[PDB]
Amino acid sequence: DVTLTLWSLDRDIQPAPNLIKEFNALNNGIKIEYRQLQFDDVVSESMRAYSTGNAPDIIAIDNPNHAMFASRGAFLDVTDMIAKSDVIKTENYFPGPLKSVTWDGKYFGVPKATNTIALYYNKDLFKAAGLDAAKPPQTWDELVDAARKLTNPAKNVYGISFSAKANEEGTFQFLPWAQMAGATYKNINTDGAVKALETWKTLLDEKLASPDTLTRSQWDSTATFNAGNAAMAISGPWEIDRMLKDAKFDWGVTLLPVPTPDAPRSSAMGDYNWAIFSKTKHPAEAFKAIEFFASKDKDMFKNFGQLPARSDIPVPPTGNALKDEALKTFVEQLKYAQPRGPSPEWPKISKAIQDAIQGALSGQMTPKAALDQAAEKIKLVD
Fold it and tell me: Which UniProt keywords apply (predicted)?
């Protein structure tokens, strides 16, 4: 057999290792060996590996990181293999995910999935507080007010859970708030972005969210929602299948609340892209594996609760009411998602934002000073 290696952060029950097992069972002359990475290590491990001459054949890379690798020659130009493919067609893909694999008018990968974040809420805790579980918060003021009402330390409940972690997750979580208030990563110190960061400060200062928000992943924050220890959660569709299994309460999911009544909805475009490293000894076999993965996209939501990056295969209902309501909401929020970059310098942009978030939330800098500093750094690097 030709043996390929594939690196991804996907957990044992998430798509990649399971797709690999299905592929390997074909006995088609190709086998794939999987290595699970941690979110925080995907970029560092894989660029080091490429630089030292032992990158894997295939990686699932976070979409904002794609341009760094593509621009540095780390990824194989798959333009001609895509053109020849019947399985993979560029017209199948949403424009944002497709653009994220492009560099210099060439394709350097194939989107794996797409996502964004939305607001989960525990309807039983809403009801118990005297709130209307059919009318979740629509505005930031409503969200914060609900979070206050739902914060009940005597019952071990925070009003809300989210992530402000000093990694790409914190940036991914903050950008929607800044963007809804009229900012972008290119202009992250507008008065609206300051208001967004002041609002985060309110959530932490008033103990509406755990202090661990500063250091905890989206996944680990949402585990507290699933356990009934946070009444609301801001997270992605990757939570759905686990939430269905673990959350022992009625819940819903709605669009991210907006800063003023009828202000624009906005969020960041999430999820990963398949890529082949440029010095693979097996470009055809690696591309065949990616074709196989793409061929299974139609079953991604029902099997894993993740969303394809594709307009050709609108996701059908599963038949589970909670899951299908989640689908409707994430499909709607996705319409407002904006790409991070493309930028080969995305990590430096993101680090600037992460540091602003931490500086403001710890009280070391005012939100204004924190974001002014970030904007100055970004102006240089971007």
Answer: Periplasm, Signal, Transport
Strand partners, 299: none
Q: 40 and 161: one domain? A: no
Kindly state whether residues 87 and 213 are assigned to the same domain: no
Give the whole-angstrom CA distance, residue 111 versus residue 160: 32
Domain count within the chain? 2
Name the token pair of 206.
């008033």
Q: Specify the residue for token string 């904007």.
A: 375
Q: Give the domain range for residue 98.
A: 1-116+267-341
Same domain? For 207 and 261 the reply is: yes
Q: Which amino acid is at 47?
A: M
**Is 193 in contact with 371 (CB distance < 8 Å)?**
yes
Please state the φ and ψ torsions of residue 344, each to the nearest 5 degrees: -65, -15
Resolution in A, one decimal? Answer: 1.4
Distance of CA 58 to the CA centre of its chain: 20
